[PDB]
Design a binder for this molecule. Structure first.
Ligand SMILES: [Zn+2]
Ligand SMILES: [Zn+2]
Ligand SMILES: [Zn+2]
Ligand SMILES: [Zn+2]
Ligand SMILES: [Zn+2]
Lengths: 76, 115
């Protein structure tokens, strides 16, 4: 398959992903094309956040879908 | 809009950086060059709010009391973005290789908003 990743209010990248991949794999590819460490990433697919343990199929991500990448740089 | 950066620098704790560490000098040099809006964005990034205490940054808080601003050395990767812990007014700063990289990553960190 092939999905898109829109980062904040800026660029958009493409990723060749399989439905069985986990979200950690997607964030790893985002690291391979962007350099952002996965632990500083969070992915949003229309409202809901994407857990690292789940897969793309669990969220029913069709081909050419646009995930929204947000930086996780703040906590308690 | 009122940030005596010398007052914040005189009330900043370090670990494992030193006050004369090169990344600390680059940090204060970069924070000096920011607009008042960008300094407020940094204050919100590190402490969750842009308000300044009436007694200066010596009375900075803080979850259970006064907690001074503190910069910590992120010994994980020079290619990772800065991070903050808010609850403790602490900024995680990696040992960046250049002043330009530190200022660029700092601006990129503080200018991500709406979340
Ligand atoms: Zn990788
Ligand atoms: Zn984290
Ligand atoms: Zn930390
Ligand atoms: Zn240059
Ligand atoms: Zn530049």
């Amino acid at each position: 398959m092939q999905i898109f990743v829109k980062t904040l209010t800026g660029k958009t990248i493409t990723l060749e992903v399989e439905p069985s991949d986990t979200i950690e794999n997607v964030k790893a590819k985002i690291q391979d094309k962007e350099g952002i460490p996965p632990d500083q990433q969070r992915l949003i697919f229309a409202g809901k956040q994407l857990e690292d343990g789940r897969t793309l199929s669990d969220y029913n991500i069709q081909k050419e879908s646009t995930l929204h990448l947000v930086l996780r740089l703040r906590g308690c | 809009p009122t940030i005596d950066i010398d007052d914040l620098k005189s009330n900043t704790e370090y670990h494992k950086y030193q006050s004369n560490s090169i990344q600390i000098q680059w940090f204060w040099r970069a924070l000096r060059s920011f607009d008042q809006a960008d300094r407020a964005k940094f204050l919100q990034f590190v402490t969750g709010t842009s308000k300044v205490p009436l007694q200066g940054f010596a009375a900075l808080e803080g979850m259970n009391g006064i907690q001074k601003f503190q910069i910590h050395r992120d010994d994980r990767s020079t290619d990772r973005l800065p991070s903050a812990h808010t609850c403790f007014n602490q900024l995680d700063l990696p040992a960046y290789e250049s002043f330009e990289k530190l200022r660029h990553m700092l601006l990129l960190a503080i200018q991500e908003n709406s979340e």
